[model samples]
Target chain A: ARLAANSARLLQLHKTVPQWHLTDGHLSIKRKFQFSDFNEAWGFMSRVALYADKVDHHPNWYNVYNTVDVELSTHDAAGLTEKDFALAKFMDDAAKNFE
Target chain B: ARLAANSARLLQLHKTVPQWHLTDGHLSIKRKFQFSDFNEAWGFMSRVALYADKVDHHPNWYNVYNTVDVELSTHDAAGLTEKDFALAKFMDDAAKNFE
Candidate 1:
């Protein structure tokens, strides 16, 4: 388990990836992405999956037609952590192609 | 599945989309899709999701990094139905753009 990201890191991450936001009741950050179609959205998730498996981190996500809602947190860390930001950043970057 | 007992309808579906095959139980049809990446696979699923929702039919599906395994059956009928073929065809068409 890792420590929760300090306030300083959290603030910086949110600033860098403006699409992500702190959650209300959970120590997680979330974002929803839209794509032209399911193919685009699935590709985005596929790109993220490799890294998620590699790092032993995963996101809570759901899909409906063209929207993918995702929340990232490190459960073992007991709160948000830098790992969340890293995955969040990857998602933010990958979504640009599909958007 | 909606009364999958209709062997006639099932046969027609196979003729239409050879990619799908009859299951041993004679109760459902299943297919596995492969993609260059996860995004393409996901996009395929998203398109199917909308149709499934519209018709009140759902697919049993599983996904890994770049593969999605799916089965179609009618819960009410406990067998394959026309609805399964409809959604399967949609998925087949959706994959074309990505491929």
Candidate 2:
């Protein structure tokens, strides 16, 4: 199943993203987006908001003028699941577009 | 240092709270509190708010009637740190009181 594979892959991926560790009882992921100005940051967040709404898996995020920090998790599952990994990969891809 | 120990403890703690994992490159933790009604849930949130404000570490949360879902992560550090672990422990203790 994708869930099993996602969990297994996340274990290995943890090495490179050492900061990426478990919290509260779920698979938690986070990223920060830095932009030149608040407008750019808000624009990026709007784009992400659209995708998040589509996926029905919104992020726990906050924006401070120009820096946007995001955290992802499956609250219903109470832990990491395939849904989170899928969202994390999507966020990474979206970041490329921003850059 | 406490940071190193906290990280190490969190690694072991992950077994029981597998849902607590890294997200977007940071440590993410989530929990869902269920109440008999929205009022109870809101009350819980209000209490948490007081503590969060004192700690200066607010939660990323949402409420749906009787259910309140919360996620915690330190945006500035971009990952798990002693602060997160300490806060997590405090929350755990708080939940005990809730029950």
Candidate 3:
């Protein structure tokens, strides 16, 4: 089931991943990740790409050198969902390697 | 010399790659690329990432599922240069494989 904007799970997830913000009128979550350089940035994206494929969930993202801006939502559900949070968590964890 | 907005080399590059448009008020070039799906899109990006690293030139890009929007410019020169065109040409050629 899709998570409502005010769902307790979402609140908990937000607490755990404070960097991500509910955006797009609360229909999505957005975050910006910065790396040391393009090499590290692209490497981060490659890992996320593989994980996104494995989970069959894709992201809306923009990249400029060391920065990656991402927006996550469940298009079919027309809002955020557990899958979105899952991927967001994965991205947060994967970004740690470059730090 | 850095290419002027009306330089002949820029004109020649434009003629050869009509799909990419001189943009950012002639300081950069922009193109939108679409692929069959995320798999193909990411694969294209992976190749470009490697090439970009090898050449030490990078692009500003956005991706959502199967589409990639790219803008290229020589930041140091603060305008389009031969490097930008070369990357654009490489991207155009690499995208051909998924077709």
Candidate 4:
């Protein structure tokens, strides 16, 4: 339901959360978020889950033990968009509570 | 740190929590637990995560949207064990809140 973020905005937002970046072959940004153990990783995911529900925008993520690799895009927008960066920013903020 | 549940207990317990079952060609019990949405599914995973930390036993689980497929076994015990059943029971109890 949102437009694809302009390249200028994408570049600017990327500066705000530099951990997230463009994946090689996809029109999405990805980041490898890590934690002390599955306990912390799963706890982090729990917070993101409720946030995803509130925003109704979700990320594609993979988890094992203590690592979570997340990829973000807006399917409705058909590419990287403001919502993606917003969620990415929100994730970095949410992750601040994890460690 | 625990031994496999005896078949007598496994059988009776299976009758109690029939949703979980022995998987094909594996020394483990598997169950596909479902919830109303990703938010709830992830929330359930969160509780199970902490419980796993306390018990120091973990389940091999997969999640997508509202479904979680969980498999339990004790690697140290070399097969399905009492710990697996205990974690299974804990999971069932934890899931009661999601609906």
- Identify the candidate with maximal TM-score: 3
- In candidate 3, stretches whose alpha carbon ends up further than 4 angstroms from where it belongs are A1-99
Q: Where does model 2 exceed 4 Å of error?
A: A1-7, A12-26, B1-99
Chain A structural similarity (TM-score) per candidate? 0.88, 0.73, 0.93, 0.87
**Candidate 1 lDDT, tens digit per residue, A1-99?**
443444666777778778888876448888989988765676567768866887888999999977899988888777887788888988887777543
Error of 2 at A2 (Å): 11
Q: Please write out the lDDT profile of model 4 over residues B3-77, one tens digit for every residue.
A: 334556666656666778876543788889998777667767897889988889999999989999998988877
TM-score of chain B of each: 0.87, 0.70, 0.94, 0.84
**Top lDDT: which candidate number?**
3
- The lDDT values for all models are 0.76, 0.60, 0.85, 0.78
Runs off by more than 4 Å, candidate 4: A1-6, A24-26, B1-49, B56-99
Q: What 10-residue stretch in candidate 4 chain B is worst by lDDT?
A: B1-10
At residue B44, give the lDDT of candidate 1: 62
Clash-forming residue pairs, model 4: none
Question: Which window of 10 residues has the lowest lDDT sum in candidate 2 chain A?
Answer: A1-10
For each candidate in turn, the interface RMSD (Å) is 4.8, 16.2, 7.8, 5.7
Candidate 1 lDDT over B1-99, as tens digits, reads 354444676677777778888887768888899987766566566657766787898999999968999888888777777888888887777666555
Angstrom error of the Cα, residue A57, model 1: value is 20
Q: State every prediction's TM-score relative to the real structure.
A: 0.50, 0.41, 0.51, 0.50
Alpha-carbon DockQ of candidate 4:
0.15
Q: Score the docking of each candidate (DockQ).
A: 0.13, 0.01, 0.04, 0.15
RMSD of each: 8.1, 21.3, 12.9, 10.4
Candidate 3 lDDT, A16-98, residue by residue in tens:
77889998557999999998777667767886888898999999999999999999999999898888888999888767754
